[PDB]
Every structure is written in structure tokens, then in C-alpha cells.
Enzyme design. Structure first.
Site, PDB file in Angstrom:
ATOM      1  N   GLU A 105      62.801  30.286 -36.838  1.00 14.04           N
ATOM      2  CA  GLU A 105      61.547  29.849 -36.335  1.00 14.04           C
ATOM      3  C   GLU A 105      60.856  30.742 -35.334  1.00 14.04           C
ATOM      4  O   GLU A 105      59.623  30.784 -35.271  1.00 14.04           O
ATOM      5  CB  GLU A 105      61.609  28.392 -35.878  1.00 14.04           C
ATOM      6  CG  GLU A 105      61.826  27.442 -37.061  1.00 14.04           C
ATOM      7  CD  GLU A 105      60.696  27.325 -38.071  1.00 14.04           C
ATOM      8  OE1 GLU A 105      59.721  28.049 -38.117  1.00 14.04           O
ATOM      9  OE2 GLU A 105      60.879  26.311 -38.912  1.00 14.04           O
ATOM     10  N   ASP A 160      51.075  28.464 -38.413  1.00 13.67           N
ATOM     11  CA  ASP A 160      52.226  28.847 -39.195  1.00 13.67           C
ATOM     12  C   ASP A 160      51.869  29.410 -40.602  1.00 13.67           C
ATOM     13  O   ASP A 160      50.703  29.698 -40.949  1.00 13.67           O
ATOM     14  CB  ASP A 160      53.123  27.611 -39.298  1.00 13.67           C
ATOM     15  CG  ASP A 160      52.559  26.547 -40.202  1.00 13.67           C
ATOM     16  OD1 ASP A 160      51.512  26.671 -40.842  1.00 13.67           O
ATOM     17  OD2 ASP A 160      53.319  25.472 -40.229  1.00 13.67           O
TER      18      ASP A 160
END
Ligand SMILES: [Cl-]
Ligand SMILES: [Cl-]
EC number: 3.2.1.17
Length: 162
Positions: free
Chosen positions: A11, A20
């Protein structure tokens, strides 16, 4: 190696709201805030989550905080899902961390759709299950990630992650 580390590797750590792989408003270690195209919303959501007026900015402490709640929630979700619980249960420690990774990333519901993949897994059919896994948007969308998990599944070792 562990879920926290493994996950923090896939992540990353961001302290400011960011978008994202799908352009969704996110923060810290993979903490998704909203699916709306509006920052405000996004802004709105972080504030409610951290419980304070952040103005789209949080501290590392806080970021790790969400991560915990997030990991914790994920395990729990896996644990109360009839398509995963069993899988989870049959799997070894390294592979369990992998289910977690995936759930984290895609939603429990998201993952509970790997029916065939889940079965191979249950039967402990590594090579097959990895081939199946690769035939996904998931795999085509975020190739390097998929490849680590998929490889971990095939091997049971943290190499891909070493
Ligand atoms: Cl939250
Ligand atoms: Cl990737």
C-alpha cells in the site's frame, strides 16, 4: 514478515489525500475514503474518521491507526463470510495473510467472487489456482501486486516480498 509489513509494502504510506489506481480518494496506508469525484466529500469523510478537522492531512500515528482498524476489520470480514471462512481455515499461516491482502484491496465481496480460485485453493492446488488467479481484471489492472500474492500462494514463502 507479516500482514502489516506486507500490506504496508503494497500500500505505501501517504499522508495527504491522494487518488488510488482507480482515482478514488484515499489516505495513509490504503485507507479508502470515498468513491465520489469530490474532494470535499473525501475531505468530509477523513474528518469524520479521524474525528477532527484535518483539512486532508493526517499524522503517521493516525494513519497507522486506520491501518489497524482496517486490518482488524478485514480479518473479521473474512471470518464471517461463508465463502471465505472455510478457505481461510484450510490455509496455512502464510497463505492466510494473502487472503487478508486481497480482501483488504478488493472487498470481501470482491474476493468472494473468485469461486473457482477459491476452490483450487481449498484443494491446495497452487499452480492451478495461480493460473486462475491471473485471469482477472485485478491481475491485468495492478500486475506487480497480483504477481507477489499469486507467487506467494504458489510457494508458501515470503520470497516475492524479501
Ligand atoms: Cl473509519
Ligand atoms: Cl501493481
Amino acid at each position: 514478515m507479516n500482514i502489516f509489513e506486507m500490506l504496508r509494502i503494497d500500500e505505501g504510506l501517504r499522508l495527504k489525500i491522494y487518488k488510488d489506481t482507480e482515482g478514488y480518494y484515499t489516505i495513509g496506508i490504503g485507507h479508502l475514503l470515498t468513491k465520489s469525484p469530490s474532494l470535499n466529500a473525501a475531505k468530509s469523510e477523513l474528518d469524520k474518521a479521524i474525528g477532527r478537522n484535518t483539512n486532508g492531512v493526517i499524522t503517521k500515528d493516525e494513519a497507522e491507526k486506520l491501518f489497524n482498524q482496517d486490518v482488524d476489520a478485514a480479518v473479521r470480514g473474512i471470518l464471517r463470510n461463508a465463502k471465505l471462512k472455510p478457505v481461510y481455515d484450510s490455509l496455512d499461516a502464510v497463505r492466510r495473510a494473502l487472503l487478508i491482502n486481497m480482501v483488504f484491496q478488493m472487498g470481501e465481496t470482491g474476493v468472494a467472487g473468485f469461486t473457482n480460485s477459491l476452490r483450487m485453493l481449498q484443494q491446495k492446488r497452487w499452480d492451478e489456482a495461480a493460473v486462475n488467479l491471473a485471469k482477472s481484471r485485478w491481475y491485468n489492472q495492478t500486475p506487480n501486486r497480483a504477481k507477489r500474492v499469486i507467487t506467494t500462494f504458489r510457494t508458501g514463502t515470503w520470497d516475492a516480498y524479501k
